[PDB]
Amino acid sequence: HAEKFRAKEIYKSENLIITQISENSFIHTSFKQTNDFGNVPCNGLIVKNNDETIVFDTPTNDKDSEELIQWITGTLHSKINAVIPTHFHDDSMGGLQAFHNHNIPSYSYSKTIELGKENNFVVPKNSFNNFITLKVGNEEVIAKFFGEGHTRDNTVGYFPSENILFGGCLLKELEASKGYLGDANVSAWSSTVEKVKKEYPNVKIVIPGHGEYGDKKLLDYTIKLFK
Ligand SMILES: [Zn+2]
Ligand SMILES: [Zn+2]
């Protein structure tokens, strides 16, 4: 990592890690319990302007979501304008009920709601097809569907003021394996990520759904992996 903004790990408990990666954005990392490999890390993104934030992805469960919400409200001293699960799997949406219990507006791609309901998961209350821009303070965030890949509903988040891309599980960390393909369209995945890369050429940081963030190289790696 050689970004002009030197990343800072500003919070660490047994269950949640916050890593500041730009002046006003932060990776949230929590864990998914798998009966096979123990706890595996899962990422989301917090963006902030003044005393307002937007969160991409929930932790897998309400307890960790509550820890995250209380950290934002209690330590970042900010309101949460919105939460945006980037796909229907638990590592993006499993802890959504906690956000609803705080009356935090939730948004996802329409297909995320459809696939969530098919699995009797709690789903967001608002939907879009195929992008939305939401205000955070005097800035905005983009949430957009570019095509199928890891799942058929996966969306990405972009914070243009700091050129931060939250790729979600559509994006892989460098050298990652292909991961869980049970819900994937591997035929479209590379083309989808090519579209993301074309749309955000000035990207500075790319955050994958699991593992280590980096720069545009994660886009190139993920494209190549699925060709
Ligand atoms: Zn997934
Ligand atoms: Zn994932």
Numbering used by the authors: 7 to 233
From the paper:
Aiming to understand the substrate profile of these enzymes, we crystallized both CJO-1 and CIM-2 in their soluble forms and solved their X-ray structures using single wavelength anomalous dispersion (SAD) from data collected at the Zn edge. CIM-2 diffraction data extended to 1.56 Å resolution, and CJO-1 to 1.34 Å. CJO-1 could be modeled with a partially oxidized Cys221, as has been observed previously in crystal structures of the B1 MBL VIM-2 (33), with 13% occupancy for a sulfenic acid. In the simulations of CJO-1, both loops remain closer to the active site, resulting in hindered access for β-lactams with bulky substituents, like piperacillin, which showed the lowest catalytic efficiency among the tested β-lactams. Among these substitutions, the presence of a lysine at position 59 (with a positively charged side chain) also modifies the surface charge distribution of CJO-1 when compared to NDM-1. This surface charge distribution is likely to generate repulsive interactions with substrates with a positive charge density in their substituents, as in the bicyclic β-lactams tested with positive charges in their C2/C3 substituents, e.g., cefepime, ceftazidime, or imipenem. Overall, the combined effects of Leu59Lys and Asn233Tyr substitutions in CJO-1 introduce a steric-electrostatic effect on the surface of the protein surrounding the active site. We generated the Lys59Leu variant of CJO-1, and we determined the resistance phenotype of E. coli cells expressing this variant. This replacement increased the MIC of cefepime, the poorest substrate of CJO-1, by almost one order of magnitude, with reduced impact on the MIC values of cefotaxime and ceftazidime. Despite other features that can fine-tune the reactivity, we conclude that the main determinant of the distinct substrate profile of CJO-1 against cefepime is based on the electrostatic repulsion with the positive charge of the lys59 residue.
Here, we report the biochemical and structural characterization of two membrane-bound MBLs: CJO-1 and CIM-2, from Chryseobacterium joostei and Chryseobacterium indologenes, respectively. Both MBLs confer β-lactam resistance on producer bacterial strains and hydrolyze several antibiotics, although with impaired efficiency compared to NDM-1. The structures confirmed that both proteins adopt the characteristic αβ/βα sandwich fold of B1 subclass MBL enzymes (0.59 Å root mean square deviation [RMSD], over 220 Cα of CJO-1 with CIM-2), with two Zn(II) ions in their active sites (respectively). Specifically, a hindered access to the active site with the contribution of a Tyr residue in loop L10 and the presence of a positively charged Lys residue in loop L3 limit hydrolysis of cephalosporins with charged C3 substituents.
